[PDB]
Amino acid sequence: SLSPSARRVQGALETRGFGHLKVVELPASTRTAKEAAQAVGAEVGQIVKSLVFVGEKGAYLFLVSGKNRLDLGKATRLVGGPLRQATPEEVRELTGFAIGGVPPVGHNTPLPAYLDEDLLGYPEVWAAGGTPRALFRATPKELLALTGAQVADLKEG
Fold first, then answer.
1. What are phi and psi of 43, to 5 degrees?
2. Potential cystine with 51: which of 46, 62, 112, 147 (Cβ 3.0-4.6 Å)?
3. CA separation (Å) from 53 to 33, 65, 110, 156?
4. CB-CB neighbours of 8 under 10 Å
5. Measured between alpha carbons, how far is 147 from 130 in angstroms, rounded to an integer?
6. Which PANTHER family match (predicted)?
């Protein structure tokens, strides 16, 4: 789409062979999963949140449903050690984008990725397109194909 970050994501999708997936631009004040979901007519649970955490051995990507919160105990047990959130600086360096709009593709560092199993419960999901104001729809199967994420039990419950 228009913004530089959004165009980078559209280009990564095209280069990947997934050019049929389109990055859509939303109202300028969109900043939450609820607002993004409202703009495209989706349930908040269909919004994919890409969270970056840092461990002792490296950084990790957690794709979480907009209706859930990441269970830190579950995250740390998956990685096998303690975790801390990536700083805005680290997220930009690692992913090439800013927190809040981290997309599932086009990163600077290959990060092991985990995908919230609840996202497999919808026919389609909406992932961040480079900024909090951009989104692109994809099926959960396509999301897995794009990221190579391991499906996992991630939510607080």
1. -80, 150
2. 62
3. 19, 16, 13, 17
4. 18
5. 15
6. CYTOPLASMIC PROTEIN
CATH number at residue 111: 3.90.960.10
Within 10 A of 17 (CB to CB), how many other CB atoms are there? 9
Q: How many domains does the chain have?
A: 1
- Distance in angstroms (rounded) separating the CA atoms of residues 64 and 25: 21
Resolution (A): 1.9
**CA–CA gap between residue 66 and residue 154 (Å, rounded):** 12
Burial readout 68-105 (b: 16 or more C-beta within 10 A, e: otherwise) = bebbeebbeebbeeebeebeeebbbebbbbebbbbbbb
> Which technique was the structure solved with, according to the deposited record?
X-ray
Half-sphere exposure for 89 (CA within 13 Å, toward CB): 0
**Cβ(36)–Cβ(135) below 8 Å:** yes
Q: Please give the residue range of the domain that contains residue 29.
A: 1-157
User: CA–CA separation, 38 vs 50, rounded Å?
Assistant: 19
Q: Are strands 150-152 and 84-85 parallel, antiparallel or unpaired?
A: unpaired
